[PDB]
Amino acid sequence: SGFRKMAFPSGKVEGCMVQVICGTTTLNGLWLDDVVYCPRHVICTSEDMLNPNYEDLLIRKSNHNFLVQAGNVQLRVIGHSMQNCVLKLKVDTANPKTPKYKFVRIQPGQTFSVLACYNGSPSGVYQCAMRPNFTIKGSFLNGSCGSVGFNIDYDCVSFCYMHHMELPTGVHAGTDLEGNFYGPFVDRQTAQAAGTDTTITVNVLAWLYAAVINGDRWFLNRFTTTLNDFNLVAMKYNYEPLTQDHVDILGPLSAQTGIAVLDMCASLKELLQNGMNGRTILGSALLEDEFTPFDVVRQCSGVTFQ
Amino acid sequence: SGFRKMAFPSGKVEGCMVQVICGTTTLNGLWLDDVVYCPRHVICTSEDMLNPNYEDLLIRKSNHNFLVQAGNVQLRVIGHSMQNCVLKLKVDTANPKTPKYKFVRIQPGQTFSVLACYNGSPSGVYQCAMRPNFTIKGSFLNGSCGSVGFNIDYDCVSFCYMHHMELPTGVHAGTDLEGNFYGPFVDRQTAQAAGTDTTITVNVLAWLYAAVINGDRWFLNRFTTTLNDFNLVAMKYNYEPLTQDHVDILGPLSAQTGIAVLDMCASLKELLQNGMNGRTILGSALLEDEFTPFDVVRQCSGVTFQ
């Protein structure tokens, strides 16, 4: 029993993290097969970041200007190319520790594990949700750029995030591993609006299910609701509209607990309208939205990897 | 910027986790050098757990009754001994993936990373505090026994916890790697009182410092206090008494922020007496006590491993 926000074991990703140096700039890179992926702003100075012309800045760089190191072993760059906002450095050596992997563009509301790195060295691991507004609320200090987010199913590591920047508001923005930013953001040191961050309703419901399974039941009421009625309430408190797809994803959890989804919606509605009145749920005084239905099932069943 | 509850990278520990089978019982073991460590209740059946005589139950076991497997590779047990509540299985092969390591008995209030395992396979990683009452609030399903807690400094993994049991109250109890239980607990399926769980005051203060560093400053007041005055309040809300040792540990954080420890105590005192009035600190609606002063410094500075 018990319910914790836990990350995937990071070992498989630890073996892929490298240090990338170009001029004065040092950040983290991801070494898979004979290719190293990193933020293209590795080529920028502090001044360049204000208004970079990446094509022109990269022209001034050759293969030998990129220094790649995996702890102690030196990697020779034998080719470089820019794919969107990522730089692909072709190296002479295939990573012997390359896991089975995919590149995945995740949807907003989905979760992943971040391996926070500095100077190519892993610092720590934690879970994140991709916010509806395509930001993340991580822990990223100077030099953390190129740190990656991932999910692990069985053998396969699915990379979904590379960290690029912190916005003036202190939230975090980045790309998929094809170098396409999540959200409207660009790799320029400028003012960038994230937009209204809504709560991931389906995740909150999944977490309420997790609570019931672990014996926190006080918030269960004798009321029910409709999708329309509920969504009217959702809109007021800046919650994502709940769809039938969402209802279907929660089906296994409703089946385990014997609580219909719309009954659980009615509980959430009261929590939103009345608050918690000093009580807590799974050790939290607010409604948690960083667990997907999958995360709850995975943890309540105890799925392992490799 | 940003502040997250993050675990140590688990790769070094992943390579040490094995499956231990004795009869019908399967749980996790820790393979270091040519010795495998596991909970001694591996030898128990469900019935045995009610009132086990471990010496007598172990007599009925020989080396060949212990099946140890590291993924696919079979380990031959060439010796077994019981050390307190742990079983030390001598195997024929030294773990090639044995990291530099120590065994450490941590103090209450200290934190560590748990690698949750099932069938010898890592499931996930999260941070825990050893509660003042020597319990932990983890996420441990059936088969998770033998999962370990650790800290990593640079090269060295310091193992501090092995999971043994869940109490009827749903909290978790276990041993150091010498097999001595933290707290008054025993490896018997019986009723066991944990005792009053107090809040780790020094950790709450460290976290308040973390908040200030990240720009959450609303709770800073124009008041101050004494240790005695503060501790009078602490006692009322079941907080650990704050000592001068605690004050000294917080010194670096007071120096960074320019907020005296006793001034920060005065803020905490008001928070305890008035609550948060609907506001949050570092995304929490309650006071967090699972970050040590070390954890805050580590994360605010960005210390890496290997």
UniProtKB/Swiss-Prot annotation, chains A, B:
Residues 1-306 are cytoplasmic. It catalyses: TSAVLQ-|-SGFRK-NH2 and SGVTFQ-|-GKFKK the two peptides corresponding to the two self-cleavage sites of the SARS 3C-like proteinase are the two most reactive peptide substrates. The enzyme exhibits a strong preference for substrates containing Gln at P1 position and Leu at P2 position. It is found in: Host cytoplasm; Host Golgi apparatus; Host nucleus. Inhibited by pyridone-containing alpha-ketoamides compounds 13a and 13b. In turn, alpha-ketoamide 13b (tert-butyl (1-((S)-1-(((S)-4-(benzylamino)-3,4-dioxo-1-((S)-2-oxopyrrolidin-3-yl)butan-2-yl)amino)-3-cyclopropyl-1-oxopropan-2-yl)-2-oxo-1,2-dihydropyridin-3-yl)carbamate) inhibits SARS-CoV-2 replication in human lung cells. Inhibited ex vivo by michael acceptor inhibitor N3. Inhibited ex vivo by compound 11a and 11b. Residues 1-306 form the Peptidase C30 domain. Coiled coil: none annotated. The active site is at residues 41, 145. Changing residue 205 to V: In strain: Zeta/P.2. There is a cross-link at residues 5, 90 (Glycyl lysine isopeptide (Lys-Gly) (interchain with G-Cter in ubiquitin)). Changing residue 142 to A: Does not affect ability to cleave and inactivate human TRMT1. 3CL-PRO exists as monomer and homodimer. Only the homodimer shows catalytic activity. Interacts with host FBXO22; this interaction promotes the proteasomal degradation of nsp5. Cleaves the C-terminus of replicase polyprotein at 11 sites. Recognizes substrates containing the core sequence [ILMVF]-Q-|-[SGACN]. Cleaves and inactivates human TRMT1, preventing tRNA guanine(26)-dimethylation of tRNAs. May cleave human NLRP1 in lung epithelial cells, thereby activating the NLRP1 inflammasome pathway. May cleave human GSDMD, triggering alternative GSDME-mediated epithelial cell death upon activation of the NLRP1 inflammasome, which may enhance the release interleukins 1B, 6, 16 and 18. Also able to bind an ADP-ribose-1''-phosphate (ADRP). This is 3C-like proteinase nsp5. It comes from Severe acute respiratory syndrome coronavirus 2 (2019-nCoV). The lineage of its organism: Viruses, Riboviria, Orthornavirae, Pisuviricota, Pisoniviricetes. The chain holds residues 3264 to 3569 of 4405 of the full protein.
